[PDB]
Symmetry: C2
Amino acid sequence: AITSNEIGTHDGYDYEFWKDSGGSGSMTLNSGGTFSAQWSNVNNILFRKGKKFDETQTHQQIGNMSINYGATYNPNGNSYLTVYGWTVDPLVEFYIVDSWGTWRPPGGTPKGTINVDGGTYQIYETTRYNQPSIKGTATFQQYWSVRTSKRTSGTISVSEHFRAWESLGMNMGNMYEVALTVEGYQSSGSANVYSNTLTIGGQSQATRVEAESMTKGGPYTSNITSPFNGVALYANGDNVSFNHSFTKANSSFSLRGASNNSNMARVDLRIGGQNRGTFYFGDQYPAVYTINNINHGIGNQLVELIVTADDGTWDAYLDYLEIR
Amino acid sequence: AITSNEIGTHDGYDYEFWKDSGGSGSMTLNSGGTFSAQWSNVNNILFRKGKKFDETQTHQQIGNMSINYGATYNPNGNSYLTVYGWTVDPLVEFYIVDSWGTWRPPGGTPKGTINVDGGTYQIYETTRYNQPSIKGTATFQQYWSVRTSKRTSGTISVSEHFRAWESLGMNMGNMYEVALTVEGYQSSGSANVYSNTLTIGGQSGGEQATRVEAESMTKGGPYTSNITSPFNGVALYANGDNVSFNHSFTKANSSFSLRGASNNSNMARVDLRIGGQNRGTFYFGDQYPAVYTINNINHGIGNQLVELIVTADDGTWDAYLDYLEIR
Ligand SMILES: [Ca+2]
Ligand SMILES: [Ca+2]
Ligand SMILES: [Ca+2]
Ligand SMILES: [Ca+2]
């Protein structure tokens, strides 16, 4: 078990144990986003699993965020069960609190409400003066959404809170972290986060682009009508390409194609000149090969479908490419 | 559900659905390494969640590998519940089979055995001729460990199988993939992989923590100096103040546990550098000795410069360092 301040990556999730002096804590990391925690007589303790970012992109540039979770939550004293994180430039510590122990945070006057995820959240902005932060001892704003009533499972549509805060004038910087978190303050407690799944890029409109409508390049690329209307790529350098306006940062690419024969045909996906994966057509029979989870960023960028491993034993036939 | 060939990364795990023509299949991706799968009347189908690699490193270079899993496994015909993957240069498709449907793979004559994970496995080397691979239609070797009887949960110490294979002259190339897999052949079936955790860099055979005292390190910058309170160690006072030492990394991944403190109630930050690159920041929130750990740092095997350096000083705190421990 973890009993001192630590950061790392555990089954794909960025985890952190943080406390100040006084009392004790214990964190056990389990699979996926899951973990349990226990604390006594602390000053301040945070246990969390989520994702850290490199401080270079807004939540809009990263994509949609949503957390689905469930927890057994047994605080004895002041405590939060919350999504938590930070932004920089400006430096902001933020919370989407679904449950709490003896006190409902954060005090003061609400700036707004949001009804989302079957619940209602009051929205607040506070100030922390000379307190611990990712940038050392500092003075920074806190942004909050706090459920009107307690729950300990469900889905938190993080990006919706973020938009609500920004629409009330609570400006967000480049992202540093989002994570499901158990906080304790001058308390004791235990929690078992038995479910916690953070999804980036989830659905908030497919585009289909016929191969024959794209630009041809290389020595032989040519149109075909069998086994479908499309194009054939016969030799290394044969490719079809088009510019596309990516309005979100992540996509799946689904290419309908086939080999001309029983040998396996390979077609590389390039975005802005960079190899992002290979589509495999094992057969002469039209099939839809999907390369999912490509993080390419928002922008107008060149999509290429290109053959590079031809040796004269197969050709690739392409019907269409769909981007979702 | 996925019902056509697809590759992706789902909840941290590299997943793949692959089938050739005929019949049908369906895969549902759940959290962590988990997934369920169904198939009917296929020729060949594979469902898997694991890790893909960039083909530049051997399993030694990547680290120890181990998978903990459990599955509900209801094949109807030929089928494997197995660890699966590939190397390149040479091209090798490999399997560590724990259960199967009507036929226990892979035929032929064992080259050896290995007792591990409470089980016994026979080891085999076969050849596939003009078959589908990660490099197109090709001819290549397959390496196998096959359990002498069926099991659908537990731990598979992948790296021990790999060493067993190599000790028998079955040489492995750079890694492309390791993954828990459900394969069907000329069959139907279903399976629910309700647990599947792939661990890279876990402990293998009483490897020891190394502790290096800050005061024995090489000092750099304008003021670095030794201290005896609140412990024996060094103080770093201004930007560029650092302590450094070559360390001989014999595996590719480490945790770094620095025992330190601020001189006061302000937060002290000390940057970790390995081989001239920034690998993280240790935080000491107050004046009391604490152990801050940065875990899961992949530096690669080799003799590399470790530096502990102050870069964010503004005259409001100093960093006190007792020792650094690498594990
Ligand atoms: Ca060709
Ligand atoms: Ca077409
Ligand atoms: Ca200083
Ligand atoms: Ca010391």
